[PDB]
Design a binder for these strands. Structure first.
Ligand SMILES: [Mg+2]
Ligand SMILES: [Mg+2]
Lengths: 223, 218
DNA sequence: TATTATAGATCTATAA
DNA sequence: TATTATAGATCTATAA
Protein backbone atom coordinates (compact mmCIF):
# COMPACT_ATOMS: atom_id res chain seq x y z
CA UNK A 1 0.00 0.00 0.00
CA UNK A 2 1.18 3.64 -0.10
CA UNK A 3 1.97 5.46 3.15
CA UNK A 4 1.80 8.95 4.56
CA UNK A 5 3.75 9.79 7.68
CA UNK A 6 3.49 12.48 10.36
CA UNK A 7 6.19 12.78 13.00
CA UNK A 8 5.80 14.07 16.53
CA UNK A 9 8.56 15.06 18.95
CA UNK A 10 11.11 14.49 16.18
CA UNK A 11 10.48 10.78 15.74
CA UNK A 12 12.12 11.19 12.28
CA UNK A 13 15.46 12.07 13.92
CA UNK A 14 15.17 9.37 16.57
CA UNK A 15 13.84 6.30 14.76
CA UNK A 16 16.59 3.86 13.77
CA UNK A 17 16.68 3.81 9.95
CA UNK A 18 17.02 0.02 9.77
CA UNK A 19 14.09 -0.56 12.09
CA UNK A 20 11.99 1.89 10.05
CA UNK A 21 13.05 0.20 6.86
CA UNK A 22 11.72 -3.16 8.08
CA UNK A 23 8.35 -1.61 8.87
CA UNK A 24 8.21 0.45 5.71
CA UNK A 25 9.09 -2.38 3.34
CA UNK A 26 6.38 -4.50 4.90
CA UNK A 27 3.70 -1.84 4.48
CA UNK A 28 4.72 -0.95 0.92
CA UNK A 29 4.62 -4.63 -0.15
CA UNK A 30 1.22 -5.19 1.46
CA UNK A 31 -1.89 -5.19 -0.73
CA UNK A 32 -5.15 -3.55 0.47
CA UNK A 33 -7.11 -6.24 2.42
CA UNK A 34 -10.88 -6.09 2.16
CA UNK A 35 -13.86 -8.11 3.45
CA UNK A 36 -17.69 -7.94 3.39
CA UNK A 37 -19.49 -5.60 5.74
CA UNK A 38 -22.42 -6.81 7.82
CA UNK A 39 -23.67 -3.27 8.59
CA UNK A 40 -27.40 -2.74 7.97
CA UNK A 41 -28.18 -1.54 4.41
CA UNK A 42 -24.65 -2.24 3.17
CA UNK A 43 -24.40 -5.97 3.78
CA UNK A 44 -21.83 -7.45 1.44
CA UNK A 45 -20.23 -4.11 0.52
CA UNK A 46 -16.44 -4.24 0.61
CA UNK A 47 -14.65 -2.53 3.49
CA UNK A 48 -11.10 -2.31 4.80
CA UNK A 49 -10.34 -5.61 6.59
CA UNK A 50 -8.52 -5.07 9.89
CA UNK A 51 -8.22 -8.76 10.66
CA UNK A 52 -6.46 -9.58 7.42
CA UNK A 53 -4.27 -6.46 7.63
CA UNK A 54 -3.21 -7.18 11.19
CA UNK A 55 -2.40 -10.81 10.38
CA UNK A 56 -0.32 -9.74 7.36
CA UNK A 57 1.75 -7.37 9.41
CA UNK A 58 2.29 -9.98 12.13
CA UNK A 59 3.33 -12.59 9.55
CA UNK A 60 5.87 -10.17 8.01
CA UNK A 61 7.37 -8.67 11.15
CA UNK A 62 7.83 -11.64 13.44
CA UNK A 63 10.28 -13.28 10.91
CA UNK A 64 12.14 -9.96 10.92
CA UNK A 65 12.71 -10.33 14.63
CA UNK A 66 10.09 -7.92 15.90
CA UNK A 67 8.51 -9.48 19.01
CA UNK A 68 4.69 -9.69 18.98
CA UNK A 69 2.42 -8.93 21.96
CA UNK A 70 5.16 -7.93 24.38
CA UNK A 71 3.76 -8.00 27.92
CA UNK A 72 3.39 -4.72 29.78
CA UNK A 73 5.22 -4.68 33.21
CA UNK A 74 3.10 -5.28 36.32
CA UNK A 75 3.71 -1.72 37.57
CA UNK A 76 1.79 -0.45 34.56
CA UNK A 77 -0.74 -3.30 34.37
CA UNK A 78 -3.65 -0.86 34.65
CA UNK A 79 -2.46 0.55 31.25
CA UNK A 80 -2.90 -2.84 29.61
CA UNK A 81 -1.55 -6.34 29.10
CA UNK A 82 0.63 -6.07 25.97
CA UNK A 83 1.90 -3.93 23.07
CA UNK A 84 1.50 -5.14 19.50
CA UNK A 85 5.18 -5.26 18.47
CA UNK A 86 8.55 -4.13 19.62
CA UNK A 87 12.19 -4.39 18.64
CA UNK A 88 15.06 -2.80 20.55
CA UNK A 89 13.89 0.71 21.57
CA UNK A 90 10.88 0.88 19.27
CA UNK A 91 7.23 0.03 20.05
CA UNK A 92 4.59 -0.41 17.30
CA UNK A 93 0.81 -0.37 17.69
CA UNK A 94 -1.38 -1.28 14.67
CA UNK A 95 -4.66 0.40 15.45
CA UNK A 96 -7.82 -0.18 13.43
CA UNK A 97 -10.27 -0.52 16.36
CA UNK A 98 -12.47 2.36 17.54
CA UNK A 99 -11.11 5.90 17.63
CA UNK A 100 -10.63 6.38 21.34
CA UNK A 101 -7.85 3.78 21.15
CA UNK A 102 -5.66 6.44 19.47
CA UNK A 103 -5.56 8.52 22.66
CA UNK A 104 -5.40 5.45 24.86
CA UNK A 105 -2.35 4.17 22.91
CA UNK A 106 -0.80 7.66 22.84
CA UNK A 107 -1.16 8.33 26.53
CA UNK A 108 0.06 4.91 27.64
CA UNK A 109 3.06 5.29 25.31
CA UNK A 110 3.76 8.62 26.98
CA UNK A 111 3.77 7.01 30.41
CA UNK A 112 5.97 4.16 29.18
CA UNK A 113 8.43 6.76 27.86
CA UNK A 114 8.39 8.87 31.02
CA UNK A 115 9.28 5.87 33.12
CA UNK A 116 11.66 4.55 30.45
CA UNK A 117 10.35 0.99 30.59
CA UNK A 118 12.03 -1.58 28.41
CA UNK A 119 10.56 -2.60 25.11
CA UNK A 120 13.00 -5.20 23.85
CA UNK A 121 15.73 -5.22 26.55
CA UNK A 122 16.20 -1.52 25.85
CA UNK A 123 14.41 1.53 27.24
CA UNK A 124 11.68 2.86 24.95
CA UNK A 125 12.72 5.72 22.70
CA UNK A 126 9.97 5.94 20.07
CA UNK A 127 6.53 4.63 19.10
CA UNK A 128 5.09 3.91 15.68
CA UNK A 129 1.28 3.93 15.31
CA UNK A 130 -0.12 2.40 12.13
CA UNK A 131 -3.52 3.52 10.89
CA UNK A 132 -5.65 3.40 7.73
CA UNK A 133 -6.65 6.42 5.69
CA UNK A 134 -10.10 7.96 5.72
CA UNK A 135 -10.47 7.06 2.05
CA UNK A 136 -11.37 3.46 2.68
CA UNK A 137 -14.94 2.52 3.61
CA UNK A 138 -14.65 0.74 6.98
CA UNK A 139 -16.57 -0.21 10.09
CA UNK A 140 -18.15 2.80 11.75
CA UNK A 141 -15.90 4.54 14.30
CA UNK A 142 -12.75 2.63 13.38
CA UNK A 143 -9.81 5.03 13.74
CA UNK A 144 -8.47 6.66 10.58
CA UNK A 145 -5.22 8.50 9.87
CA UNK A 146 -6.53 12.04 9.31
CA UNK A 147 -8.41 11.85 12.60
CA UNK A 148 -5.31 10.66 14.43
CA UNK A 149 -3.26 13.40 12.73
CA UNK A 150 -5.67 16.13 13.76
CA UNK A 151 -5.84 14.89 17.35
CA UNK A 152 -2.08 14.48 17.79
CA UNK A 153 -1.44 17.80 16.12
CA UNK A 154 -3.64 19.43 18.79
CA UNK A 155 -1.94 17.57 21.64
CA UNK A 156 1.45 18.69 20.29
CA UNK A 157 0.35 22.35 20.08
CA UNK A 158 -0.52 22.13 23.73
CA UNK A 159 2.57 20.21 24.87
CA UNK A 160 0.57 17.27 26.14
CA UNK A 161 3.13 14.61 25.24
CA UNK A 162 6.91 14.42 24.75
CA UNK A 163 7.27 10.84 23.46
CA UNK A 164 8.43 10.60 19.84
CA UNK A 165 5.69 9.12 17.68
CA UNK A 166 5.74 8.32 14.00
CA UNK A 167 2.08 8.16 12.87
CA UNK A 168 1.65 6.11 9.68
CA UNK A 169 -1.35 6.23 7.38
CA UNK A 170 -2.01 3.40 4.91
CA UNK A 171 -3.38 4.78 1.68
CA UNK A 172 -3.76 4.08 -2.05
CA UNK A 173 -4.36 6.13 -5.16
CA UNK A 174 -8.00 6.57 -6.07
CA UNK A 175 -9.28 5.31 -9.46
CA UNK A 176 -6.21 3.21 -10.07
CA UNK A 177 -6.03 -0.51 -10.87
CA UNK A 178 -4.46 -2.23 -7.84
CA UNK A 179 -4.21 -5.72 -6.39
CA UNK A 180 -6.41 -6.39 -3.40
CA UNK A 181 -6.60 -9.38 -1.04
CA UNK A 182 -10.28 -10.27 -0.50
CA UNK A 183 -11.03 -12.58 2.43
CA UNK A 184 -14.14 -14.45 3.52
CA UNK A 185 -14.24 -15.56 7.19
CA UNK A 186 -16.22 -18.31 8.94
CA UNK A 187 -18.76 -15.88 10.41
CA UNK A 188 -20.15 -12.54 9.29
CA UNK A 189 -18.73 -10.68 12.29
CA UNK A 190 -15.50 -10.94 14.33
CA UNK A 191 -14.24 -14.22 12.95
CA UNK A 192 -10.50 -14.48 12.26
CA UNK A 193 -10.99 -17.97 10.73
CA UNK A 194 -10.42 -17.82 6.95
CA UNK A 195 -12.82 -19.67 4.67
CA UNK A 196 -11.39 -18.25 1.44
CA UNK A 197 -8.74 -15.71 0.53
CA UNK A 198 -7.93 -14.56 -3.00
CA UNK A 199 -5.82 -11.85 -4.58
CA UNK A 200 -7.94 -10.03 -7.13
CA UNK A 201 -7.93 -6.87 -9.23
CA UNK A 202 -9.79 -3.82 -8.07
CA UNK A 203 -9.80 -0.07 -7.52
CA UNK A 204 -11.17 2.52 -5.14
CA UNK A 205 -13.91 4.67 -6.83
CA UNK A 206 -13.81 8.37 -5.74
CA UNK A 207 -17.40 9.24 -4.86
CA UNK A 208 -16.80 12.88 -4.05
CA UNK A 209 -18.84 15.61 -5.71
CA UNK A 210 -18.09 19.32 -5.84
CA UNK A 211 -20.22 19.67 -2.66
CA UNK A 212 -18.98 16.87 -0.47
CA UNK A 213 -15.86 18.73 0.79
CA UNK A 214 -13.85 15.54 0.24
CA UNK A 215 -15.53 13.73 3.14
CA UNK A 216 -16.93 10.96 1.02
CA UNK A 217 -15.22 7.71 1.47
CA UNK A 218 -14.39 5.70 -1.61
CA UNK A 219 -16.22 2.62 -2.87
CA UNK A 220 -14.03 -0.46 -3.31
CA UNK A 221 -14.72 -2.71 -6.29
CA UNK A 222 -12.99 -5.93 -7.33
CA UNK A 223 -13.18 -7.95 -10.46
CA UNK B 1 -27.01 4.07 43.75
CA UNK B 2 -24.09 4.65 46.11
CA UNK B 3 -21.07 6.54 44.90
CA UNK B 4 -17.34 6.84 45.37
CA UNK B 5 -15.41 9.94 44.20
CA UNK B 6 -11.79 10.59 43.27
CA UNK B 7 -10.69 14.14 42.49
CA UNK B 8 -7.84 15.33 40.29
CA UNK B 9 -6.28 18.82 39.90
CA UNK B 10 -8.28 20.14 42.87
CA UNK B 11 -11.71 19.45 41.43
CA UNK B 12 -12.95 19.21 45.02
CA UNK B 13 -12.39 22.90 45.57
CA UNK B 14 -13.00 24.09 42.01
CA UNK B 15 -16.29 22.31 41.22
CA UNK B 16 -19.35 24.42 42.06
CA UNK B 17 -21.09 22.81 45.06
CA UNK B 18 -24.57 23.50 43.72
CA UNK B 19 -23.79 21.96 40.34
CA UNK B 20 -22.28 18.95 42.07
CA UNK B 21 -25.41 18.66 44.25
CA UNK B 22 -27.56 18.41 41.11
CA UNK B 23 -25.47 15.58 39.75
CA UNK B 24 -25.08 13.80 43.08
CA UNK B 25 -28.77 13.79 43.99
CA UNK B 26 -29.52 12.18 40.62
CA UNK B 27 -26.99 9.44 41.05
CA UNK B 28 -27.97 8.75 44.63
CA UNK B 29 -31.67 8.29 43.89
CA UNK B 30 -31.09 6.16 40.81
CA UNK B 31 -31.80 2.41 41.01
CA UNK B 32 -29.23 -0.03 39.54
CA UNK B 33 -30.30 -0.81 35.91
CA UNK B 34 -29.69 -4.31 34.62
CA UNK B 35 -30.41 -6.28 31.47
CA UNK B 36 -29.57 -9.66 29.95
CA UNK B 37 -26.13 -10.41 28.50
CA UNK B 38 -25.96 -11.80 24.97
CA UNK B 39 -22.29 -12.93 25.39
CA UNK B 40 -21.78 -16.54 24.23
CA UNK B 41 -21.04 -18.23 27.50
CA UNK B 42 -23.53 -16.32 29.57
CA UNK B 43 -26.63 -15.56 27.62
CA UNK B 44 -29.32 -14.33 29.93
CA UNK B 45 -27.06 -13.58 32.89
CA UNK B 46 -27.77 -10.14 34.37
CA UNK B 47 -25.36 -7.32 33.67
CA UNK B 48 -25.14 -3.59 34.24
CA UNK B 49 -27.42 -1.90 31.65
CA UNK B 50 -25.70 1.20 30.19
CA UNK B 51 -28.68 2.04 28.03
CA UNK B 52 -31.14 2.25 30.92
CA UNK B 53 -28.61 4.05 33.11
CA UNK B 54 -27.80 6.65 30.48
CA UNK B 55 -31.46 7.31 29.74
CA UNK B 56 -32.30 7.70 33.42
CA UNK B 57 -29.55 10.29 33.87
CA UNK B 58 -30.64 12.19 30.76
CA UNK B 59 -34.27 12.23 31.93
CA UNK B 60 -33.20 13.68 35.30
CA UNK B 61 -30.62 16.19 34.20
CA UNK B 62 -32.23 17.76 31.20
CA UNK B 63 -35.20 19.13 33.26
CA UNK B 64 -32.57 20.57 35.64
CA UNK B 65 -31.12 22.62 32.74
CA UNK B 66 -28.08 20.53 32.03
CA UNK B 67 -27.90 20.62 28.23
CA UNK B 68 -27.49 17.18 26.59
CA UNK B 69 -25.22 16.47 23.65
CA UNK B 70 -23.85 19.98 23.44
CA UNK B 71 -22.17 20.29 20.03
CA UNK B 72 -18.40 20.63 19.98
CA UNK B 73 -17.47 23.84 18.00
CA UNK B 74 -16.11 23.29 14.50
CA UNK B 75 -12.61 24.39 15.45
CA UNK B 76 -12.30 21.34 17.71
CA UNK B 77 -14.35 18.98 15.54
CA UNK B 78 -11.50 16.49 15.24
CA UNK B 79 -12.09 15.85 19.00
CA UNK B 80 -15.68 14.82 18.36
CA UNK B 81 -19.22 15.89 17.68
CA UNK B 82 -20.70 16.43 21.13
CA UNK B 83 -20.32 16.24 24.92
CA UNK B 84 -22.86 14.38 27.06
CA UNK B 85 -23.97 17.19 29.37
CA UNK B 86 -22.87 20.68 30.39
CA UNK B 87 -24.18 23.44 32.65
CA UNK B 88 -22.37 26.71 33.15
CA UNK B 89 -18.65 25.88 33.13
CA UNK B 90 -18.99 22.20 33.96
CA UNK B 91 -18.91 19.26 31.54
CA UNK B 92 -20.24 15.77 32.40
CA UNK B 93 -19.40 12.57 30.56
CA UNK B 94 -21.22 9.33 31.49
CA UNK B 95 -18.90 6.65 30.25
CA UNK B 96 -19.89 2.98 30.04
CA UNK B 97 -18.41 2.21 26.59
CA UNK B 98 -15.05 0.54 26.07
CA UNK B 99 -12.14 1.45 28.25
CA UNK B 100 -10.08 3.56 25.85
CA UNK B 101 -12.87 6.10 26.06
CA UNK B 102 -11.61 7.04 29.50
CA UNK B 103 -8.38 8.48 28.08
CA UNK B 104 -10.13 9.90 25.02
CA UNK B 105 -12.60 11.70 27.30
CA UNK B 106 -9.78 12.86 29.60
CA UNK B 107 -7.60 14.20 26.81
CA UNK B 108 -10.35 15.97 25.01
CA UNK B 109 -11.43 17.55 28.35
CA UNK B 110 -7.84 18.75 28.81
CA UNK B 111 -7.92 20.36 25.38
CA UNK B 112 -11.34 21.92 25.95
CA UNK B 113 -9.85 23.45 29.09
CA UNK B 114 -6.60 24.69 27.53
CA UNK B 115 -8.54 26.36 24.75
CA UNK B 116 -11.37 27.67 26.90
CA UNK B 117 -14.15 26.35 24.84
CA UNK B 118 -17.61 27.31 25.90
CA UNK B 119 -19.65 24.62 27.60
CA UNK B 120 -22.87 26.48 28.46
CA UNK B 121 -22.12 30.16 27.81
CA UNK B 122 -19.02 29.93 30.02
CA UNK B 123 -15.54 28.58 29.34
CA UNK B 124 -14.98 24.99 30.55
CA UNK B 125 -13.48 24.78 34.04
CA UNK B 126 -14.08 21.23 35.35
CA UNK B 127 -15.14 17.81 34.07
CA UNK B 128 -17.14 15.15 35.90
CA UNK B 129 -16.66 11.62 34.46
CA UNK B 130 -19.26 9.05 35.69
CA UNK B 131 -18.34 5.35 35.58
CA UNK B 132 -19.64 2.03 37.03
CA UNK B 133 -17.75 -0.01 39.61
CA UNK B 134 -15.90 -3.22 38.75
CA UNK B 135 -18.30 -5.06 41.12
CA UNK B 136 -21.01 -5.26 38.50
CA UNK B 137 -20.82 -7.92 35.80
CA UNK B 138 -20.97 -6.02 32.47
CA UNK B 139 -20.06 -6.32 28.82
CA UNK B 140 -16.42 -7.15 28.15
CA UNK B 141 -14.07 -4.17 28.02
CA UNK B 142 -16.67 -1.71 29.25
CA UNK B 143 -14.93 0.90 31.38
CA UNK B 144 -15.07 0.48 35.17
CA UNK B 145 -14.21 2.94 37.97
CA UNK B 146 -11.17 1.27 39.48
CA UNK B 147 -9.49 1.02 36.07
CA UNK B 148 -10.26 4.74 35.49
CA UNK B 149 -8.92 5.64 38.97
CA UNK B 150 -5.73 3.66 38.34
CA UNK B 151 -5.13 5.31 34.99
CA UNK B 152 -5.88 8.86 36.08
CA UNK B 153 -3.83 8.28 39.28
CA UNK B 154 -0.83 7.33 37.15
CA UNK B 155 -1.30 10.35 34.89
CA UNK B 156 -1.49 12.58 37.99
CA UNK B 157 1.70 10.98 39.41
CA UNK B 158 3.46 12.04 36.22
CA UNK B 159 1.73 15.47 36.10
CA UNK B 160 0.34 14.79 32.64
CA UNK B 161 -2.93 16.74 32.66
CA UNK B 162 -4.06 19.94 34.37
CA UNK B 163 -7.83 20.04 33.98
CA UNK B 164 -9.79 19.48 37.22
CA UNK B 165 -11.71 16.16 36.98
CA UNK B 166 -14.06 14.63 39.52
CA UNK B 167 -14.22 10.86 38.72
CA UNK B 168 -17.40 9.20 40.05
CA UNK B 169 -17.87 5.47 40.49
CA UNK B 170 -21.42 4.05 40.81
CA UNK B 171 -21.54 1.24 43.34
CA UNK B 172 -23.79 -0.69 45.71
CA UNK B 173 -23.22 -2.59 48.94
CA UNK B 174 -22.93 -6.35 48.36
CA UNK B 175 -25.39 -8.89 49.77
CA UNK B 176 -27.94 -6.25 50.59
CA UNK B 177 -31.42 -5.96 49.05
CA UNK B 178 -31.55 -2.93 46.77
CA UNK B 179 -33.83 -1.34 44.18
CA UNK B 180 -33.22 -2.55 40.63
CA UNK B 181 -34.74 -1.71 37.27
CA UNK B 182 -34.62 -4.80 34.99
CA UNK B 183 -35.27 -4.24 31.30
CA UNK B 184 -35.79 -6.28 28.20
CA UNK B 185 -35.17 -4.33 24.94
CA UNK B 186 -36.58 -5.06 21.46
CA UNK B 187 -33.36 -6.77 20.28
CA UNK B 188 -30.79 -8.76 22.17
CA UNK B 189 -28.00 -6.31 21.33
CA UNK B 190 -27.82 -2.50 20.95
CA UNK B 191 -31.51 -1.78 21.04
CA UNK B 192 -32.66 1.18 23.12
CA UNK B 193 -36.33 0.32 22.56
CA UNK B 194 -37.96 -0.97 25.77
CA UNK B 195 -40.16 -4.11 25.43
CA UNK B 196 -40.50 -4.81 29.15
CA UNK B 197 -39.34 -2.97 32.25
CA UNK B 198 -39.90 -3.95 35.86
CA UNK B 199 -38.84 -2.17 39.09
CA UNK B 200 -37.93 -4.97 41.53
CA UNK B 201 -35.76 -5.75 44.52
CA UNK B 202 -32.55 -7.69 44.11
CA UNK B 203 -28.95 -7.88 45.25
CA UNK B 204 -25.36 -8.28 44.22
CA UNK B 205 -23.98 -11.56 45.52
CA UNK B 206 -20.36 -11.60 46.56
CA UNK B 207 -18.24 -14.77 46.30
CA UNK B 208 -15.13 -12.88 47.52
CA UNK B 209 -13.56 -13.93 50.86
CA UNK B 210 -11.41 -9.08 43.56
CA UNK B 211 -14.11 -10.99 41.69
CA UNK B 212 -17.15 -9.39 40.21
CA UNK B 213 -20.45 -10.07 41.85
CA UNK B 214 -23.52 -11.83 40.48
CA UNK B 215 -26.71 -9.82 40.18
CA UNK B 216 -30.02 -11.44 41.14
CA UNK B 217 -33.57 -10.07 41.14
CA UNK B 218 -36.68 -11.21 43.04
C1' DT C 1 -12.39 -27.38 31.87
C1' DA C 2 -13.98 -22.48 33.23
C1' DT C 3 -13.13 -17.64 34.26
C1' DT C 4 -10.96 -13.16 33.45
C1' DA C 5 -8.66 -9.20 31.48
C1' DT C 6 -7.64 -6.97 27.75
C1' DA C 7 -7.57 -6.14 22.72
C1' DG C 8 -9.80 -6.06 18.74
C1' DA C 9 -14.04 -5.97 15.75
C1' DT C 10 -17.86 -3.90 14.45
C1' DC C 11 -22.41 -3.52 15.12
C1' DT C 12 -26.84 0.05 16.00
C1' DA C 13 -28.45 4.87 17.55
C1' DT C 14 -28.80 9.33 16.27
C1' DA C 15 -28.37 13.94 14.27
C1' DA C 16 -26.69 17.02 10.59
C1' DT D 1 -33.90 8.76 0.96
C1' DA D 2 -28.51 8.45 1.26
C1' DT D 3 -24.22 9.75 3.63
C1' DT D 4 -21.35 11.78 6.86
C1' DA D 5 -20.11 11.87 11.60
C1' DT D 6 -19.15 10.21 16.03
C1' DA D 7 -20.95 7.93 20.37
C1' DG D 8 -22.35 4.09 22.49
C1' DA D 9 -23.04 -0.95 22.84
C1' DT D 10 -21.15 -5.07 23.11
C1' DC D 11 -19.88 -8.77 20.78
C1' DT D 12 -15.65 -12.59 19.70
C1' DA D 13 -10.43 -13.77 19.96
C1' DT D 14 -6.82 -14.96 22.73
C1' DA D 15 -3.87 -15.79 26.47
C1' DA D 16 -3.08 -15.82 31.33
MG1 LIG E 1 -3.65 -3.13 17.73
MG1 LIG F 1 -21.15 8.74 27.30
Amino acid sequence: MKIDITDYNHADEILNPQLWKEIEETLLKMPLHVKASDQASKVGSLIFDPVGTNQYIKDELVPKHWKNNIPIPKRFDFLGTDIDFGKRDTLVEVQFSNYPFLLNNTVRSELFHKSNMDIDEEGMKVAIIITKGHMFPASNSSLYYEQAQNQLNSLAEYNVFDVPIRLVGLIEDFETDIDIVSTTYADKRYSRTITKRDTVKGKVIDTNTPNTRRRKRGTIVTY
